């Protein structure tokens, strides 16, 4: 390749206080780059980026372990493409060198020979040995942060030309694997802070039968996919990314899940009963604003008659403090007005006489349902407020796992309780929330697997915008067990196909 | 590297002499101009450096012609802006790594200047100094593009006379593998600059498509947004709509407009006469909308009229005399064609149209600009242009090759319809951004197809492929029966100068 | 010895290396073509302007060094990803015998705090002073001082800045300056890249074009000081690297429109009311956040006639476009809510069209009472909206887009005339395209194709609006065949000349 030698420690040392040698059985071993993995399939039109991987130590698991108790890095790293194709095939890659400081996306074919770059046949027996060279404009590289270090792009040049069974299409895939040159160091040895250098997202190891549902106060009961189901719903609870951003109106405890917190002023009407308007406050004791969510944390995003239970306090003699049950219609279109957008909601309950209930803080807790809808509530009189997006997109073949329980119904003549569902349970909301990791592709690869038994039971995908999908093209209800553990594997780009279940 | 059952190498014994480069043009170039070394060593493809060689190929097809000059580089070509001059050798490799089950030969020329130009035939081929290679061979196979020229250099924006490398099938491609389809050769084209390529001197300095959505965008056959991407097979192949046809480098075809709200309406001069029995008639004397007036020339209608046909109804601007309203908005009826009895004929510059009215309206006569309501009996045929007589029209949207369709861009229109409920889709080729964006730029054209592909930028999903020819029209491969959709949230992006013989891969 | 009271102005330097740093981790270094070493070539920001109405202080023009001051740097750099070293600007200065000025040109280094710049301080870094009445150009180093080994082109982060401000004030007319500038001997680019854009323009005349705010050809080009000169228009506005701000579509067909549900019910004394709940017109659906509407909402007042496709059950009529009457602003009755998704329209009716609620997509009719100002949003509450257009230059009127609105009116014939900033072609141009903005005006000449009447020159501002120097007070009305094309990029203390 066209392409001068790159110094690496040695335009380092002098402004750096150490430079700090690593194993040298690490420069001994290849090892695979977390996502630089693909598979040519005869349908790629040529243009597709295969893979585009910065250097960086988060190539090598070793060097991303290793960074975390330094302050710097430097150095030039050796790759190797390595391509599952036979003879009887003909195609091409070309994999580039993109320096800093480029453009991301949409690189077209021609581009794509204007660096330096090999191309090679999917023929090929060895590996394709690269050069990744540090082109940087600094001393050294901070590693705990990323900056603008060359990229390694493979896209598809010439397309693929085989046979291709009938039973299976035949694909070429590739791996990539890395090791650091002789030059490459690290600088200053810093106490190791565990906490976010490139550490691998973890799960709480907890059955989700031992989990609390995160969009109704309640045990997780079922973990099922339905394809009848609607699957993409408008959530607002139970929202959270991989990352650690809450969505919507999702909150971090799980006793905050659908109830509210509220000053009530009671009020009689007659043939009505005695009506409570709530002002709406956050449940930590702090006020609620109008503002970029559609409602106060934890307040439920579903339609019907909730009962609710507040802590009433009377004026009346021979009671002082008592649960009193009212009834509040949410939605999705209501003549009480109810408006928890702008934190004024109202409730009522049907009393022959004044209950003489003093003004105050209260925070209702929801007792039961009645007429129960899986949809978004009325949160500004009719009037559309910023909500969450619905969960997806998907790709075909790809449905939306739901964790299931039960809720207590209003009913006078079916039994059948109401099966509310969320996309995660609480622990995994408020897992996300506090560790705050960093996130390095558009899909976390999961395993669900029973504990005792070791019986992988599938393989699953967590996207960052917090929804998990299962490969599954059946169209009825299928339940699974929920005594197994979560676990990742690795980051995996969003168009990973799984493999299907069922 | 896994096969040794293909050729890997070739001869490069051409039988012709080594060309000076730029070392005859320094003595009158008055400059020192230098292109970078880097440049020099890099084999990088210009976009006109796809070809595909498919069985349905016949020999004697040029697969390729590059004639020498900066433009086969894309270095070079970015650098030719900067320059008046240049001269030099190209060298250039031919990457055709074909299939081991396949077989055929090529046959690589070195066409000299001033030769005609169209058509080399394959007794004709061999008698330059050429090179015979499979299409089966491994390495690549590096050319000389010497530049034979009786000047001291070439100027660089004159298409002057220079060596043509000559590429046609020699011996057709054939495939025995056992059954399935046939395999289809992708080869490439690179090149650098010889050790002697060199630009003359320094002077004051590409296509593209614009970054919108398909969904962004404004239909050119109707005022609408664009709300579908689909093929169409129960839809005729060839038709000859007027509106949205422009060509790459911007040449309007028929009555193509520019602006967007031009589209389905006309400006004219109304004379309003009521007539008993029939209601307010308003005759239109056709004028241009922009305020000059009408000329009949190379276009059958002012710019912006329909290219269709059916009973449209139009908003006018009527000024009225009676008493309690001045100005108002008039829905006119107008059948359109293509046989009528109202005397349609938007070619000399006067059309004819009516409303239902119990009593004289008492219109104004003068200038007004009908813009469209509805449809009454939609037809997606030409109207009456000339009182039923012949025009001077565009061609019909073609010709394709066999498995080739025309992608249509789908809007709704606003329907009056007294039993059915559907609208009316009405498609175009090109939707009005493009059109402004081709009569804005003015491309310039190396070969008759755009090798184009549609990204969803945000997923990374590439759908297809799609030729761009340059009379301004996008093909794909198609096979199927039913009409397959595609979503409108898409980018294109220009890919390659490819000739009429590219093979795309077929979807659907 | 003998001191001489008269040295040249020479700039002391002390040589910077630019490769030599550089190389070792620049992947590769790259030569320039050796002649772009010999001549000044004008900065495509190179163009200021001295007047008697500038203090003493004002910065005239304030350059950065690095690849887009020369356009042959400028047009190599779209093939690389990085350059590094040093240049050289001349100043051209244009008066004549009867002005006194000095200016002064300052070497003002990176991370400087680029906040003030007195008098006193801008010779406290290495200059030269200029007289405005010299015959002869004045040439400067432009030295890379730097932290880095090179420099990002994609990323203009902080190089050496060539600061020029008024010292001594110009007495007694309009002093042209030009800035000119080639690479010095120490230059090269890093890195070789494929090329993926200096600012040029969409060649149609302002007769061809689409107004950006009424969905009708632009007929009029003019400008008109008795109209309020800074309006808060949320359609047509669009940045100059490609912002939208407001309501701006992009879509030409999108102007004056809306997409939504329309439910149909009928009423008593006032006819068939439908509820429109609106959404985004390329099919999805509209959600409220930082902007007022959705894209293509009239932002005009008054009484839209709108047309909506509709559905009856009816017998001898399936389906028709019915004419509904809808008032937009100032102050409405009818409950007008494009900011959250909800609005209202009417038509008299003696009975009930029983008409099926659907997807709707309303264009505009004619207007009654045309007002220009801004409709009801949030049923009068305040709404995330378009900054005024502003500020102007004392002497400098907006320039205004003309068209003719249909109309419904009872007593007067004159049709209404909309202005705009900008049309939408230069809208779909600008938001497509996508350019890096290099300064804070572009100088445009309206000149005529054919013939080459060049009738005035105007500042592009970046805010997506026009400005011409205008001394008078009344309308003029300007021929619409003309092509803008760019000069250069300007100063925004830049002085025009005066039209009218």
Redesign the interface.
């Known amino acids: 390749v066209?392409?001068?030698?790159?110094?690496g420690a040695?335009?380092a040392a002098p402004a750096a206080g150490q430079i700090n040698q690593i194993d040298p059985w690490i420069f001994q071993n290849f090892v695979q780059c977390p996502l630089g993995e693909f598979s040519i399939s005869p349908?790629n039109?040529?243009?597709?980026?295969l893979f585009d991987l910065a250097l960086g130590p988060g190539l090598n698991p070793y060097l991303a372990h290793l960074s975390a108790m330094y302050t710097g890095w430097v150095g030039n790293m050796e790759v190797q493409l390595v391509l599952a194709?036979?003879?009887?095939?003909?195609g091409?890659v070309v994999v580039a060198?993109?320096?800093?400081?480029?453009?991301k996306?949409?690189?077209?074919?021609?581009?794509?020979?204007?660096?330096?770059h090999v191309?090679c046949?999917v023929?090929?027996?060895?590996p394709i040995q690269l050069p990744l060279?540090?082109?940087?404009?600094?001393?050294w590289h901070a590693t705990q942060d990323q900056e603008?270090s060359?990229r390694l792009v493979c896209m598809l040049?010439?397309?693929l030309?085989?046979?291709?069974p009938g039973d299976e299409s035949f694909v070429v895939s590739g791996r990539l694997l890395s090791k650091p040159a002789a030059d490459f160091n690290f600088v200053y040895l810093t106490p190791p802070i565990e906490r976010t250098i490139y550490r691998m997202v973890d799960l709480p190891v907890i059955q989700p039968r031992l989990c609390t549902h995160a969009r109704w106060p309640a045990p997780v009961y079922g973990l099922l996919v339905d394809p009848s189901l609607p699957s993409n719903p408008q959530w607002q609870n139970g929202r959270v990314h991989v990352d650690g951003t809450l969505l919507g109106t999702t909150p971090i405890s799980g006793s905050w899940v659908s109830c509210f917190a509220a000053e009530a002023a009671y009020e009689f009407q007659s043939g009505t009963g005695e009506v409570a308007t709530f002002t709406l406050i956050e449940q930590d004791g702090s006020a609620y604003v109008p503002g970029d969510r559609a409602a106060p944390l934890g307040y439920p995003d579903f339609s019907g008659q909730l009962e609710i239970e507040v802590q009433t306090e009377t004026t009346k003699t021979g009671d002082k403090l008592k649960v009193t049950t009212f009834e509040m219609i949410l939605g999705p279109t209501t003549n009480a007005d109810q408006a928890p957008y702008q934190g004024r909601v109202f409730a009522s309950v049907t009393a022959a006489a004044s209950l003489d209930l003093v003004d105050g803080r209260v925070r209702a807790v929801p007792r039961s349902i009645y007429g129960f809808q899986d949809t978004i509530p009325e949160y500004?009189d009719?009037?559309?407020?910023?909500?969450a997006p619905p969960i997806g997109p998907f790709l075909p073949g790809e449905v939306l796992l739901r964790f299931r329980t039960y809720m207590r119904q209003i009913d006078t003549a079916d039994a059948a309780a109401e099966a509310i569902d969320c996309a995660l349970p609480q622990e995994f909301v408020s897992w996300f929330a506090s560790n705050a990791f960093t996130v390095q592709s558009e899909a976390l690869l999961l395993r669900y697997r029973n504990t005792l038994t070791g019986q992988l039971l599938f393989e699953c995908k967590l996207y960052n915008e917090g929804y998990i999908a299962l490969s599954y093209s059946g169209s009825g209800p299928l339940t699974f067990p929920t005594d197994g553990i979560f676990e990742v594997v690795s980051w995996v780009p969003?168009?990973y196909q799984l493999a299907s279940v069922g």
């Open positions: 066209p392409i001068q030698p790159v110094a040695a335009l349908r039109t040529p243009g597709e980026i194709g036979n003879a009887f095939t003909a091409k060198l993109v320096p800093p400081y480029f453009p996306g949409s690189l077209t074919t021609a581009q794509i020979t204007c660096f330096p191309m046949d023929r090929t027996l060895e060279l540090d082109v940087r404009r600094v001393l603008e060359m040049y010439t397309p030309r085989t046979n291709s500004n009719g009037l559309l407020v910023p909500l969003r168009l």
